[PDB]
Write a protein that binds this ligand. Structure first.
Ligand SMILES: O=c1ccc2c([nH]1)CCC[C@@H]2NCCCCCCCCCCN[C@H]1CCCc2[nH]c(=O)ccc21
Ligand SMILES: O=c1ccc2c([nH]1)CCC[C@@H]2NCCCCCCCCCCN[C@H]1CCCc2[nH]c(=O)ccc21
Ligand SMILES: *[C@@H]1O[C@H](CO)[C@@H](O)[C@H](O)[C@H]1NC(C)=O
Ligand SMILES: *[C@@H]1O[C@H](CO)[C@@H](O)[C@H](O)[C@H]1NC(C)=O
Ligand SMILES: *[C@@H]1O[C@H](CO)[C@@H](O)[C@H](O)[C@H]1NC(C)=O
Ligand SMILES: *[C@@H]1O[C@H](CO)[C@@H](O)[C@H](O)[C@H]1NC(C)=O
Lengths: 528, 528
């Protein structure tokens, strides 16, 4: 039977799922690590012990313990990102969609979820991998990994909570795919890892980390890059945050051992309830527990690794959305609301820039404000709102990605860059938010091909084109089928817009603003 | 006889001069101070001793000792600014053009020349006051004053070379006009002082200086303002420069007395030959001997005087030209030449910004470069050349004038602002230089009304309109005859373009760039 597969960890039994009036096989909830519970909380993952008998992989697994968004109860725009299965620390599982009949050796794509390293589930309706696996005939895998304090609490020097264990969870899932996917019909020589936001940062992190490089072939980064300002902290900052988390739960703070033991006795929800209290600054687009530059998973600073070519050399496809910042301003800056056009006063603008660059002195805040203010019309609410939206997206997503892509391309074997700017016709979020962080995903997973979701015919066509670019790149290292998406080169820096109209090619994506964020501001903050 | 006038200093005999197929009276070379020669070099001027008999004022006086431009021998573009009479330290004279027949009490305009405080003559063909005096029926006066070391060498504390004596020369000429112009038919209650470049800065300086305020009624500033970065130095800098001038002429430097005595024994040309050697930095748009913030002519810093309203409250008319910087780049920055289009490499751009803001550290130079570079097309020679031209004009002329006009308007009694952007049809300078520093003067003096000069009919009409705006403002405090040039107000900040087409009104002249030069950069240079 097509639904029975034997792996090095044991036998697994999948389920047949309907898709676009056809069917494919799904193997849901396959364990790839021992449950990281009890004394294992905060520690590096352990490989799953093989089992005798048949593992029932007919149903989605639990989601890892995480913050649950309750801002708009019942609103699908926000709830579509919340765990849709029960939460449990026993959550290290992966899901596989396999074309029917079973391929012999086909392209594999592995999806890494990305809610700021503090949230995310492999089971969301928008991550249903059946449409992509079916339409492009690829073996689709979605993994999971611990988020928040459970995956990133870091007390460098301790082996009990060394940090980066969520990244090590991802790596273990990639090790399992490398070692077992051939049994499901996947080609272990041709695995593409892809992810959005923190998943896009994670993808870039495995490209950098020596210990992860050999587990995959190529990579896709969507609105996220390893060097993002919110994606990592120093070991000293990680340490202070863990100590502050301990302080919020009245823990003995005398030694690492005392702190960790205290933290291990708390119910999951007690850690999540105070997680946001440890940020060192009043801020937006900053998350408490994130990867640490530790000297092990990352041998040195991300910038010297990028500068010296210390990273996997292969092909990458990556890009950003037009309004990366809106989601974060809506949820965290004064003057923005879901049900209004959110025109911002000059005062809210200024308080928004302070929130957006928490690490800046007054001179730096003045430099951002001058850069994004139209002084001929400074009281324009729309320009203020939009300027703030660009500050957040440029600083947190676009310019760090552009810096990553120019550094990478100097040593890599092929780069394709995109700018996604299509506002979906059925978007439930307000107009002012534009092309939102995360909203290209539904096109990558082919949701527009399902009629009941109400997309237009041109949106279904856009989805088909993106899925085929992603799968063709995964299979060959080039999104084009031999209108051509041109290679991004050091010299010409070309990229394409991705939307419903004829493909346009442009050059130097947001160069003007990114010279400010990547070269001028850091110099300013460092000199002063 | 119309040509004989009796003054408090004695009788003066003028000459009849032809103008536009008519005639008017001219009283040229009337002395208003004792010659500042010998032991009087560097000292405050002394009032001219009255004379018995008749002063022959039929011919232009000598010009003060100054640097002579020899860059383009015989080229009229440059030579039109050079002294056209013999140079002499005996040069403190004024010229008067009087309508015929002699008015009883008409509006008076007094012109202050302005070659960077180191050059200028009241006798240039472009300053011939007969056209304006005749066409607008005003009594026109042009004064003179010592320039260079002779007028601005400053050794604060010494009474032998206290500094600002060139400004005191201007003041003495204004005192003489106040006391005697009624005899020539001028109204001492209605005197407008006007000047361009350093003359525009000087005008603003008499508006600020308590000791000059009561000598005139209203003021016109053309491409110059008192707070310009090149218009004044501290007493410590003035002192260092005088000491360095002494060092270049092998003077005993033991005391002020020794230095001054040494300097007084040098021929005029020996001082001028080394004048440029005392600048403290490699630079452009910086002059050696300029006014000093001394605690006397200027009671405190120009900025606190501007901020506190410590200045004459009256009406002012002022403005700038479109390409104020070109003259200075041509003469002093690498890559610019008179006979080529002067497209500038990225390298010459950068070396041009260093020259343009000599007082800036590397971070500030980076801030100017980022502000003026189109990073999508950074190797564009034309954009590089034009960006540099704007940096020079914005930093040296436009933004300081805008800062002056916003501070002044808060306390003044009426402000009219203009932007002159007409490229004359017969300009002999290259196209790349645009609307050059100083080239609105010929329109203010009505040169286009003389056919042999080859201007177009629309240029003659532009000239007539500017002369009538200037004279009507001088007479009433409003350029408009009761298409209206609107008042510049704190709130709306309106100004008009001055050129051959229908008047357009705009707001906030170069605000974007001036917030950078007036608010951000100074903060940056001060913090770091
Ligand atoms: O797999 C996943 C899971 C979720 C998501 C994606 N992917 C991709 C698309 C985006 C989505 N998550 C977007 C989610 C939108 C981001 C903001 C959620 C934080 C709310 C709780 C904290 N509230 C405040 C106080 C703390 C600081 C702070 N900081 C802020 O930036 C905003 C609010 C606040
Ligand atoms: O009454 C007057 C007299 C002259 C002028 C005007 N008005 C108004 C219109 C302009 C004209 N003067 C413009 C004149 C154009 C400005 C430059 C003349 C300086 C040349 C000598 C010094 N050569 C170099 C070395 C020293 C530093 C340095 N710095 C520089 O900014 C340029 C060159 C150099
Ligand atoms: C597989 O496990 C799920 C768990 O709820 C259950 O629905 C299904 O009956 C199981 N099938 C087998 C063969 O155990
Ligand atoms: C990638 O590598 C191959 C072989 O190593 C080389 O021939 C090719 O030119 C490279 N492609 C790019 C875009 O660098
Ligand atoms: C006036 O002085 C000038 C000086 O050159 C001379 O040309 C003219 O003859 C003089 N006239 C009288 C009346 O002295
Ligand atoms: C100027 O002053 C007069 C009288 O002192 C006043 O009535 C008038 O409004 C003022 N004009 C401006 C533009 O301030």
């Amino acid at each position: 039977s097509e639904l029975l597969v034997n792996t090095k960890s044991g036998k697994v039994m999948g389920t047949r799922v309907p898709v676009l009036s056809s069917h494919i096989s799904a193997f849901l909830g396959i364990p790839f690590a021992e449950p990281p519970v009890g004394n294992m909380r905060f520690r590096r993952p352990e490989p799953k012990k093989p089992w005798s008998g048949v593992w029932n992989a007919s149903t989605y697994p639990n989601n890892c313990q995480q913050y649950v968004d309750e801002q708009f109860p019942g609103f699908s725009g926000s709830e579509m990102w919340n765990p849709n299965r029960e939460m449990s620390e026993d959550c290290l599982y992966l899901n596989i969609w396999v074309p029917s009949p079973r391929p012999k050796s086909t392209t594999v794509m592995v999806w890494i979820y990305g809610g700021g390293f503090y949230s995310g589930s492999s089971t969301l309706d928008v991550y249903n991998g059946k449409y992509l696996a079916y339409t492009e005939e690829v073996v689709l895998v979605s993994l999971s990994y611990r988020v928040g304090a459970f995956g990133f609490l870091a007390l460098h020097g301790s082996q009990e909570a060394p940090g980066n264990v969520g990244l090590l969870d991802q790596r273990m899932a990639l090790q399992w795919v490398h070692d077992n996917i051939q049994f499901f019909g996947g080609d272990p020589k041709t695995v593409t890892i892809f992810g959005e936001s923190a998943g896009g940062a994670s993808v870039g992190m495995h490209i950098l980390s020596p210990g992860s490089r050999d587990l995959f072939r190529r990579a896709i980064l969507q609105s996220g890059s390893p060097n993002c300002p919110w994606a990592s902290v120093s070991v000293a900052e990680g340490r202070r945050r863990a100590v502050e988390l301990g302080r919020n739960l009245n823990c003995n703070l005398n030694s690492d051992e005392e702190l960790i033991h205290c933290l291990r006795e708390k119910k999951p929800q007690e850690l999540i309830d105070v997680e946001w209290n440890v940020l060192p600054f009043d801020s937006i687009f900053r998350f408490s527990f994130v990867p640490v530059i530790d000297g092990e998973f990352f041998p040195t600073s991300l910038e010297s690794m990028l500068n010296s070519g210390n990273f996997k050399k292969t092909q990458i496809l990556l890009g950003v959305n037009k309004d990366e910042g809106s989601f974060f301003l809506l949820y965290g800056a004064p003057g923005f609301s879901k049900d209004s056009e959110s025109k911002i006063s000059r005062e809210d603008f200024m308080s928004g820039v302070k929130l957006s660059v928490p690490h800046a002195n007054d001179l730096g805040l003045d430099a951002v404000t001058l850069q994004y203010t139209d002084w001929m019309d400074d009281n324009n609410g729309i320009k203020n709102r939009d300027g703030l939206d660009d500050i957040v997206g440029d600083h947190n997503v676009i310019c760090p990605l552009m810096h990553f892509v120019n550094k990478y391309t100097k040593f890599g074997n092929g780069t394709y860059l995109y700018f996604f700017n299509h506002r979906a016709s059925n978007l439930v979020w307000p107009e002012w938010m534009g092309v939102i962080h995360g909203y290209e995903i539904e096109f990558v997973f082919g949701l527009p091909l399902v009629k009941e979701l109400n997309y237009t015919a041109e949106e279904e066509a856009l989805s088909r084109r993106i899925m085929h670019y992603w799968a063709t790149f995964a299979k060959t290292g080039n999104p084009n089928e031999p209108s051509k998406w041109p290679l991004f080169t050091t010299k010409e820096q070309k990229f394409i817009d991705l939307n419903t109209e004829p493909m346009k090619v442009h050059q130097r994506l947001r160069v003007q603003m990114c010279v400010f964020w990547n070269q001028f501001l850091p110099k300013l903050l460092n000199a002063t």
